[PDB]
Design a protein around this ligand. Structure first.
Ligand SMILES: *[C@@H]1O[C@H](CO)[C@@H](O[C@@H]2O[C@H](CO)[C@@H](O)[C@H](O)[C@H]2NC(C)=O)[C@H](O)[C@H]1NC(C)=O
Ligand SMILES: *[C@@H]1O[C@H](CO)[C@@H](O)[C@H](O)[C@H]1NC(C)=O
Length: 369
């Protein structure tokens, strides 16, 4: 497969689409790579945000008529895809080197606080548009829930929020992440260091111990993304595995994994606990981390969840839906697993078509004013 050892711009150009990349600088000096599909093979803007240990690839890794990024371009949208700090394409800084611990001293807190405002405000300036549609998967969902409840000036800029496999609280997840999560913070630091989260073969074998055993592929259990997220074999293109395997995982910090462990352990949707009153005060101007309330998020939201989703589990998803003021739509696809939202064979007709039609319903209402 030519897409395996290709960059995200090369994949877009391979499928016959216009490709554009942009370097954006955050308020805290990180240099993010934005991917753009300006037209199909001024238009309304859609911003696609990847999840845990992923990248822009996620929206352009199936075929031209089965990948969200590509179908949105063909449906008449100006497609923008974000890359979270620390991944393959966003591992540059104005001052810091990738060899310094301070470079990796971030979690999804900084992604929501600095990556999203910088990325969205760059787009709105470039296009001249006043608003964007926001689509998030997995961790991209939580970045949205934080950014849009914490930054009301940014929320105003969002027409509609499409949450695919939504994650706020991760209190009841049964994914191998709750296993890594329930280890003490000092042990995670001891095993993986203070920089990039790079687990070796022995750790992934331990994380995989009798949880990834009623699977045909099994090579998928060696992959960090497939392991933490979970895959539905009834709905994956098992011939495309090497494309998914090469592009994912795409990189994150040990601190981001520490934050996800704190989310499992404390069962609270909050900012990162730095370990002491003094350390927290140095970051938040208070001794305990600020809590994030989904009730403060007034953006019109459309939610898709999977009944067999390990990470964005049924129990946590049901709690979340009761907290979304202005829930426009919600659907639970009973057999879907976490990765089905981005790589499901049936995702174009059970998901991608509904997203396009809700955007058009919003457009019809807009054009009516
Ligand atoms: C499922 O995966 C296979 C393998 O990635 C896809 O087949 C490739 O499709 C492209 C575009 O049509 C061709 O250029 C390749 O030569 C095909 N073969 C291989 C082995 O890469 C297939 O189209 C995917 N999609 C579905 C829905 O089956
Ligand atoms: C992607 O590959 C193309 C072609 O080699 C190159 O021009 C571009 O700068 C690359 N982008 C990144 C982010 O590596």
């Amino acid at each position: 497969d030519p897409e395996t050892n290709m960059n995200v711009s090369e994949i877009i150009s391979y499928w016959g689409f216009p490709s554009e990349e942009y370097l954006v600088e955050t308020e805290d000096g990180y240099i993010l790579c934005l991917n753009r599909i300006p037209h199909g093979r001024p238009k309304p803007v859609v911003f696609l945000q990847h999840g845990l240990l992923a990248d822009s690839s996620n929206w352009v890794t199936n075929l031209a008529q089965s990948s969200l990024g590509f179908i949105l371009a063909d449906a008449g949208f100006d497609v923008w895809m974000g890359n979270s700090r620390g991944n393959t394409w966003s591992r540059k800084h104005k001052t810091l080197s990738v060899s310094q611990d301070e470079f990796w001293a971030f979690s999804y807190d900084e992604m929501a606080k600095y990556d999203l405002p910088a990325s969205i405000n760059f787009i709105l300036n470039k296009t001249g548009q006043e608003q964007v549609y926001y689509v998030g998967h997995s961790q991209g969902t939580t970045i949205g829930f934080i950014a849009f409840s914490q930054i009301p000036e940014l929320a105003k800029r969002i027409k509609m929020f499409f949450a695919l496999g939504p994650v706020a609280s991760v209190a009841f997840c049964t994914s191998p992440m709750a296993k890594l999560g329930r280890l003490p913070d000092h042990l995670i630091k001891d095993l993986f260091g203070d920089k990039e989260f790079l687990p070796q073969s022995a750790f992934l074998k331990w994380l995989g111990t009798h949880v990834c055993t009623h699977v045909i592929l099994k090579e998928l259990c060696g992959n960090l993304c497939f392991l933490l997220c979970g895959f539905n074999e009834r709905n994956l293109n098992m011939s495309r595995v090497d494309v998914y395997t090469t592009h994912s995982p795409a990189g994150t910090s040990v601190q981001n994994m520490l934050h996800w462990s704190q989310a499992v352990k404390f069962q609270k949707f909050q900012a990162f606990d730095w370990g002491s009153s003094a350390k927290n005060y140095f970051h938040y101007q208070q001794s305990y981390p600020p809590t994030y309330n989904v009730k403060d998020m007034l953006v019109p939201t459309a939610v898709w969840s999977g009944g067999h989703d390990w990470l964005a589990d049924v129990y946590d998803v049901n709690i979340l839906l009761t907290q979304i003021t202005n829930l426009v739509f919600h659907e639970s696809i009973p057999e879907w697993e976490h990765l089905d939202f981005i790589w499901g064979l049936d995702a174009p007709w059970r998901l991608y078509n509904k997203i396009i039609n809700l955007m058009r319903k919003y457009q019809a209402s807009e054009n009516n004013l």
